[PDB]
């Protein structure tokens, strides 16, 4: 039930421990320790900025309007959520995360403009 | 299509590149470099805090309930969005941004209290 305890569990089980890991992301001699702390903050903020760009700010589970390409993975839901742990899944689609991230950004950019014109 | 590429374009064109600039805001000898990095983070967080205060957290385009005073600028939409680049616009209303920011804060404070009493 602690940090990374679910690392060996199935994706559908591990997805219930997202707050366990989220809370462990934040907290001349002594300078390299400041560099490590500053860097940890910068890393954290980049992931948070990215979620904001995709329209997922403030949440751990975020649904989008980006469809899945089976060229990315053609496994079904029982193969992915009831087997392939998150470590296994990450390896399998590592080659596609930049394509997916680009498509999440493009979608949010269309959504924010369509919503401003409906408030007009 | 890169960072600040749209700086010379019209406001209505440049507004479509907001993620290009947002992503370039984050990333004894060596101390002044830590000071620069810490300062960059602090600057970033103040702008993000301010958007949160105004009720614009998590978005690049945010509509508000604050009306425009033509004492701030009496130009129409074709003058502003189809000419005056953002650099030109920023110069023209620089004298009024603190008045506008104060009015955005006051509005959000009334909105959050009206919404808590409707959930009661």
């Amino acid at each position, epitope marked *: 039930l602690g940090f990374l305890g679910a690392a060996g569990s199935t994706m559908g089980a591990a997805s219930m421990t997202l707050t366990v890991q989220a809370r462990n992301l934040l907290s001349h001699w002594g300078i390299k320790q400041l560099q490590a702390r500053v860097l940890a903050v910068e890393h954290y903020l980049r992931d948070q900025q990215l979620l904001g760009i995709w329209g997922c700010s403030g949440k751990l589970i975020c649904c989008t309007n980006v469809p899945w390409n089976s060229s990315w993975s053609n496994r079904n839901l029982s193969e992915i959520w009831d087997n392939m742990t998150w470590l296994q899944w990450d390896k399998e689609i590592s080659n596609y995360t930049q394509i997916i991230y680009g498509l999440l950004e493009e979608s949010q950019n269309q959504q924010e403009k369509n919503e*401003q*014109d409906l408030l007009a | 299509l890169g960072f600040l590429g749209a700086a010379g374009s019209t*406001m209505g064109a440049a507004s479509m590149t907001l993620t290009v600039q947002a992503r370039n805001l984050l990333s004894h000898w060596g101390i002044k470099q830590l000071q620069a990095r810490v300062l960059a983070v602090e600057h970033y967080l103040r702008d993000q805090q301010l958007l949160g205060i105004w009720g614009c957290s998590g978005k690049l385009i945010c509509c508000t309930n604050v009306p425009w005073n033509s004492s701030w600028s009496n130009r129409n939409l074709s003058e502003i969005w189809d000419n005056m680049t953002w650099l030109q616009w920023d110069k023209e209303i620089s004298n009024y941004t603190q008045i506008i920011y104060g009015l955005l804060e006051e509005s959000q404070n009334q909105q959050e209290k009206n919404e808590q009493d409707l959930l009661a």
Partner: antibody
Amino acid sequence: EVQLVETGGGLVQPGGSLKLSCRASGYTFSSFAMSWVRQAPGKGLEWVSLINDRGGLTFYVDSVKGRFTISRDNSKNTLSLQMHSLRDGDTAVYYCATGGMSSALQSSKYYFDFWGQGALVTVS
Amino acid sequence: ALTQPPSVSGSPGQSVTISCTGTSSDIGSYNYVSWYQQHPGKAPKLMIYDVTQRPSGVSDRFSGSKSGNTASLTISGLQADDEADYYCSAYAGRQTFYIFGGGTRLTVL
């Protein structure tokens, strides 16, 4: 000079389908919202559908809401309407018109600036 | 949806008024009333928009106005060539975007 030319269909059986299309020239197509306005042979004008200049937002009159699709192609300057289930009550002249909406950073419309001549759609 | 009279008429040189009465969540809520001129056999032409404005390309003999839930089109120096079906329309919200009246068959005597 702005021209909107309907190049759609004619006679269709009840319960069938018919697609209309309209070619635009003389203006920047992509700068304007467009709509379809219908006129039954013995009646006045009725608004049927509206589409955004970027093609993302569509609106319909309730009477065709689950039956008609309005679309747009900004590369080919083409407006189109796909009609399904075609009731006898859908017989009318269908006009291609420019207007009905703006994009927030533009002055508003809420009126129709340009009209085509209209395709006659007959359901028998 | 909107009510406007049939058969408005008058002789050349006389003015005529074509009325358009709607409802509160219509003409009474938004100042977006437009008028169109349709000669039989032709597509409608825009004459008036935003209650009082006219597009470039039309004469100043055509002037719009409104009060309460009623809008109207005034034609001043009436000409024989003004015979047409005049229609009013209005923006009526984001649920029922546009509504129209029936046509007014303006006849010049």
